[PDB]
Amino acid sequence: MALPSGSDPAFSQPKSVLDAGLTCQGASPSSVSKPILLVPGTGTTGPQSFDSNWIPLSAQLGYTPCWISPPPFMLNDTQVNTEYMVNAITTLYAGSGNNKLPVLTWSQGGLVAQWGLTFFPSIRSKVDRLMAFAPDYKGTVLAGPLDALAVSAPSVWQLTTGSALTTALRNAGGLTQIVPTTNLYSATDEAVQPQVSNSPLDSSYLFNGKNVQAQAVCGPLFVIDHAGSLTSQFSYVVGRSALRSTTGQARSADYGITDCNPLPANDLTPEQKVAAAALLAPAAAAIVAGPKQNCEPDLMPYARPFAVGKRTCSGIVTP
């Protein structure tokens, strides 16, 4: 069962809009040394996801941090958020001298990266690895679209168990890794479940990926939440391993029981540590003030054939 092949799907957004969502720290994305592309979680911008963590930590490892901030706060259709990532990879690949670059993500950003790899073949040769923290490739069973209000953000419909989007990703072949991938997650994630089995049943798991459930290393009683999966010192050691590895994946030898520190990464400034612990703060107001609807967004034509029979806003998905 081959992945989608051939030409990249058309973008629904103007290219100038997509360019407007990409920023690099201290550099233009068109002339950048050793870029890393950071893809944020639902309800946040790039800086809100990563200022307290991988922006400074990647810079200290010698990368130029770059990020996308799809408006409004990653709450729009995940297929549109992916356009921002695909355009950013095209730009940063050329902008770094036509060299592959790593992609590092949090929460929704992981599914965005894997959706892009699944459906946009041009970027597969431009991404050298994926380091995904708390990704939800299967669609969580918690915090659904009809909780407390009959309307929810477009991406919340999509990142729910049973959605047409997650159905299409799995049916198109997307729960197997496409580039060398590390997925770091936690059995105690309060946003993404199920994560408890340390097996392909977990939402963060990809076949052939380096699938690191924290409790598998640190013990059954180790506790780290959805944000701590991104910010902790344990997470830094795994992510640093993945970024340095000649295999493109974190290596088990590079981390162990003595790295099982759930608190913010050692090298963050005190300000950054307090901000990292407080991560998830802005995604309350953003949600309340953002787009909301009573149905899952329609699948774009490149993805519709993989979720025939699911229901989206326009009705039943037909091929």
Domain boundaries, the chain: 1-319
The whole-angstrom separation of Cα 170 and Cα 166 is 6
- Quote the CA–CA distance of 297 and 152 in Å, as a whole number: 11
130: left (phi over 0), alpha (psi -120 to 50) or beta: beta
Active site residue 226: yes
Find the catalytic residue in 136, 186, 226, 229. 226
The whole-angstrom separation of Cα 24 and Cα 107 is 21
Span 1-319 CATH architecture = 3-Layer(aba) Sandwich (3.40)
Q: In angstroms, rounded to a whole number, what is the distance separating the alpha carbons of residues 104 and 38?
A: 5
CB 117, CB 179: distance < 8 Å = yes
* Residue among 132, 213, 142 at smallest CA distance from 174: 132
Rounded Cα–Cα distance for residues 111 and 78 (Å): 9
CA atoms of 177 and 186, how far apart (whole Å)? 19
Dihedral sign computed on CA atoms, order 147, 148, 150, 152: negative
Q: Hey, which residues does 212 pair with through a beta bridge?
A: 184
The span from the CA of 311 to the CA of 303, in Å, is 13
Query: Which technique was used to obtain these atomic coordinates?
Result: X-ray
Residue 107 designated active-site: yes
Which of these is catalytic: 189, 202, 235, 241? 189
Is residue 245 exposed (0-12), middle (13-18) or buried (19+ Cβ within 10 Å)?
middle
147 is catalytic: no
Record the tokens describing residue 44, joined without a space: 């946040």
Query: Distance from first CA to last CA of the chain, Å, rounded?
Result: 18
**Catalytic one among 52, 58, 96, 107?**
107
CB count within 10 Å of CB 51 equals 18
Pairing of strands 35-39, 101-106: parallel
User: Residue holding tokens 């953003």?
Assistant: 286
What resolution in angstroms, rounded to 1 decimal? 1.6
